[PDB]
Amino acid sequence: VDESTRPALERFQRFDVDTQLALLWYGYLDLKPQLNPAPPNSVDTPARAVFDHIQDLSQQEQLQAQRDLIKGGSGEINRGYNALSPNAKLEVWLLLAQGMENGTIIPMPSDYQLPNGTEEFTAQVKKLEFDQRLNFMLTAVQAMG
Numbered sequence: 001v002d003e004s005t006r007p008a009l010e011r012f013q014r015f016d017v018d019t020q021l022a023l024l025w026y027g028y029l030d031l032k033p034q035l036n037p038a039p040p041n042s043v044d045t046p047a048r049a050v051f052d053h054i055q056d057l058s059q060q061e062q063l064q065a066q067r068d069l070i071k072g073g074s075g076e077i078n079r080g081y082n083a084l085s086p087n088a089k090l091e092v093w094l095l096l097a098q099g100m101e102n103g104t105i106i107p108m109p110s111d112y113q114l115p116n117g118t119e120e121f122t123a124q125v126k127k128l129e130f131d132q133r134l135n136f137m138l139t140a141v142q143a144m145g
């Protein structure tokens, strides 16, 4: 990330894990119109295998699996994610978001609201250029774990 994007990324990593997940969901909704949907052109993608392992879990454990991706760990799902390239890692998150929209991954609860104190960060992200937001995501997903 560049000089203008580093502060936003650093703030993001300082939120609690649940807040990070929610912000990633809201970020997806904001970016979605300008994103090409997953999967990529390759069929045997390693990202699909990691997503598929998460999809096969109960919804509650899908949530725990996504929490563990941000927190880090050495379990099977973390290891599958950690072996991926940064763009493949981002593919997993994109597949998860698409799964939330098609009903195969646990969705954002209708009663959830962000903890107080996210307004400044979301305002700052809204001011970033599209290229800066792409670099934010590539750097953020690689830094998880």
Ligand SMILES: CC1=C(/C=C/C(C)=C/C=C/C(C)=C/C=C/C=C(C)/C=C/C=C(C)/C=C/C2=C(C)C(=O)CCC2(C)C)C(C)(C)CCC1=O
Pocket (backbone or CB within 6 Å): 034, 035, 036, 037
């Ligand atoms: C006939 C003939 C010829 C003709 C040659 C011709 C016709 C040449 C034409 C060549 C063309 C059309 C090349 C296109 C390349 C596209 C690239 C690299 C796209 C990258 C996209 C990216 C990174 C996307 C990224 C992204 C993704 C995916 C998103 O999902 C959203 C974000 C973002 C947009 C950033 C010659 C000239 C050779 C000789 C003369 C002659 O007779």
